[PDB]
C-alpha cells in the first residue's frame, strides 16, 4: 500500500527553472547538417492521383479470390500488427 | 449591388498563379459588395462597422 503526498525531496525535488544539468536538445538530423538537398525528400509535392481506365469490360474471377483462402485450422495466416508508424530514419 | 470580377495581378510580385492565366486550375472569380459605413471606437480607436456582408465574399466566394 502506497501513501499519497510524499514528504520533502521525495517528489519534484528541483524546480523546473533550476535543473542541475544543462540541457542539450538536438534540432537537426546529423545526416542532413551539410547535405541539404530537398528534392530527394519532397514527399508532399510528389504524390499523384491517376484516372484509371473505364472499369467496365473487366473479368473479376472470384475463383482466384477464393482459391487463396484457407481451408483448415492450420494453413491460416494472419497479418501481424505493425509496431510503429514509419519514421524514415528519425 | 455586387461586383463579379477577377482581381488583377499585384505589381509587387511576378507571380502569376493567382491570376486568370491558370483559370481552369483554380477558381479565380470573386464577388464583392459595396463597402458600408465604418467608424472608430471612442475608447480604443478600433474600426467599427455593422456590415453583414463585409468579408464573406472576399474570403469564400471563389
Amino acid at each position: 500500500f502506497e501513501h499519497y503526498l510524499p514528504m520533502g525531496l521525495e517528489y519534484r525535488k528541483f524546480s523546473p527553472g533550476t535543473q542541475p544539468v544543462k540541457a542539450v536538445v538536438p534540432h537537426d538530423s546529423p545526416k542532413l547538417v551539410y547535405d541539404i538537398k530537398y528534392f530527394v525528400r519532397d514527399y508532399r509535392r510528389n504524390n499523384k492521383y491517376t484516372a484509371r481506365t473505364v472499369d467496365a469490360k473487366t473479368t473479376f474471377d472470384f475463383d482466384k479470390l477464393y482459391a487463396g483462402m484457407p481451408t483448415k485450422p492450420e494453413q491460416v495466416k494472419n497479418v501481424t500488427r505493425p509496431l510503429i508508424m514509419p519514421t524514415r530514419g528519425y | 449591388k455586387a461586383r463579379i470580377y477577377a482581381p488583377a495581378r499585384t505589381a509587387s510580385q511576378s507571380g502569376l498563379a493567382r491570376t486568370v492565366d491558370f483559370a481552369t486550375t483554380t477558381p479565380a472569380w470573386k464577388i464583392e459588395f459595396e463597402p458600408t459605413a465604418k467608424w472608430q471606437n471612442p475608447l480604443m480607436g478600433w474600426t467599427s462597422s455593422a456590415d453583414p456582408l463585409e468579408n464573406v465574399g472576399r474570403s469564400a466566394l471563389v
Binding site: - | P42, L43, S48, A50
Partner: protein, 363 residues
C-alpha cells in the same frame, strides 16, 4: 447648438456600437425614471455619467445599460458639494436631473432637494459654457399657490432654474406608471396587506397617468427638437380619469371581490397622518413607508392634476401616448395576479373563460 447636439458627432446607424456624440450627466439616474432615461440615451450610442448617493449594489443594474467606457459611475455624491457636480458635468454638454423626494427627512428638507441644489446646478451649468441642454423634471401638480409643500418647492425650483438658465427645458409629467413606480405599487400595498384603504373625500379628482417609456422617447425627442429649449412641457395620457375610477379598474385588475376603500373627510385623513408627520423630522427615515400618508397627498387629492389647456405635450413631440389602462404597461401589474389562471374566487371573469368550461358550469 440648435441641432448640432444630435447631428455633428453621430457615428453609426444608432445601435450599441454606434456613437451619437452626445455627452450627458443624469442625476437621480438609479431612480425609477432616471434609470429608463439613461438606458434610453445610452442605447442610441451616447456617453452617460451616473453619479450616485445610494449603494453600488442598487446601481450595478445601470452598468450593463452602456457599452465599454460609456457608463461613468461616480460614487459618494454630495449634493451640498459643488466639486462633485463640476466633475460630473466637466465634459457633458447635456444635463439631466431627476433627484426627487416625496417625504421630508431630518437630514434633507423639501427646499434643500427641490430649490437650492437645482439652482446651484444651473448656475454651474451656465458657468461651464459648453452645456447645450439642461433638462429638469417636476410634477404636473406643481404650482406656487398650492398648500402642498413639495409641489410649492417644485414650482419654486422650476422658476429658479428658468431664471438661472434661460434655455433649460422643464418637463412636468403627471402620474408615471411602471414596474417599480411609486404610483401603482403603493396602491397595491394599500389595497392588499392592509385592513382598510382611506380615500380622500369623494376622490373624484381628475388625473392623467402616463407611461415611462413615453417619457424616455419624449426626452429623446426633446433632445431632437431645438425649439423646446427654454420651455415647459407637460406629459399626460390619452384619457382623463378620477381616483375612484382608477381604484375600480385596479380592483377589476386584481379581481378583488371586497371593496376595502372608504371615502373620508380630509381632516379625518390629516388627523390619521398627523402623528407620523410631526415626527417626520429628528428621524433618519424608515422603510416601507408609503408616500401617501401625508397631508400634502391629501391636498393633491383635493385638486385635479391633468395637463393644462394649451400646454406643450406629447403631440408637440409627434408622440402618441400608449394606453396606460391596458396594454403592455398593464402586464406587470397583472403579474400580481399572474394575468389570471386560477387565482381568486371570481365568477364575473366568466367573460374570458374558455367555451367548453362555461357550458360545464352552465352560464
Amino acid at each position: 447648438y440648435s441641432s448640432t447636439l444630435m447631428t455633428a458627432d453621430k457615428l453609426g446607424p444608432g445601435g450599441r456600437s454606434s456613437v451619437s456624440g452626445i455627452t450627458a450627466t443624469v442625476f437621480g439616474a438609479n431612480g425609477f425614471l432616471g434609470s429608463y432615461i439613461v438606458n434610453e440615451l445610452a442605447k442610441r450610442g451616447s456617453q452617460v455619467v451616473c453619479p450616485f448617493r445610494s449603494t453600488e449594489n442598487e446601481a450595478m443594474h445601470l452598468k450593463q445599460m452602456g457599452d465599454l467606457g460609456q457608463i461613468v459611475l461616480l460614487p459618494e455624491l454630495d449634493i451640498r458639494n459643488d466639486d462633485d457636480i463640476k466633475r460630473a458635468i466637466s465634459r457633458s454638454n447635456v444635463i439631466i436631473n431627476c433627484v426627487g423626494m416625496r417625504l421630508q427627512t431630518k437630514n434633507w428638507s423639501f427646499e434643500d432637494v427641490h430649490v437650492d441644489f437645482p439652482k446651484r446646478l444651473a448656475k454651474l451649468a451656465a458657468e461651464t459654457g459648453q452645456v447645450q441642454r439642461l433638462i429638469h423634471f417636476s410634477d404636473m401638480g406643481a404650482d406656487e399657490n398650492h398648500k402642498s409643500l413639495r409641489m410649492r418647492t417644485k414650482a419654486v425650483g422650476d422658476k429658479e432654474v428658468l431664471d438661472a438658465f434661460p434655455d433649460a427645458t422643464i418637463v412636468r409629467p403627471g402620474d408615471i406608471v411602471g414596474i417599480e413606480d411609486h404610483f401603482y405599487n403603493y396602491l397595491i400595498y394599500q389595497l392588499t396587506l392592509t385592513v382598510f384603504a382611506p380615500v380622500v373625500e369623494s376622490g373624484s379628482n381628475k388625473i392623467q397617468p402616463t407611461y415611462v417609456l413615453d417619457v424616455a422617447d419624449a426626452v429623446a425627442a426633446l433632445l431632437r427638437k431645438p425649439d423646446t429649449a427654454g420651455k415647459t412641457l407637460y406629459l399626460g395620457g390619452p384619457e382623463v380619469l378620477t381616483m375612484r375610477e382608477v381604484y375600480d379598474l385596479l380592483l377589476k385588475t386584481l379581481r378583488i371581490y371586497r371593496d376595502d376603500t372608504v371615502h373620508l373627510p380630509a381632516w379625518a385623513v390629516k388627523a390619521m397622518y398627523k402623528p407620523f408627520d410631526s415626527v417626520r423630522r429628528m428621524l433618519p427615515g424608515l422603510p416601507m413607508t408609503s408616500p401617501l400618508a401625508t397631508e400634502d397627498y391629501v391636498e393633491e387629492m383635493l385638486r385635479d392634476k391633468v395637463v393644462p389647456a394649451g400646454a406643450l405635450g406629447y403631440a408637440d413631440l409627434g408622440i402618441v401616448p400608449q394606453k396606460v389602462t391596458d396594454g403592455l404597461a398593464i402586464e406587470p401589474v397583472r403579474h400580481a395576479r399572474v394575468g389570471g389562471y386560477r387565482w381568486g374566487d371570481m365568477s364575473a371573469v366568466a367573460k374570458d373563460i374558455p367555451e367548453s368550461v362555461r357550458k360545464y358550469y352552465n352560464i
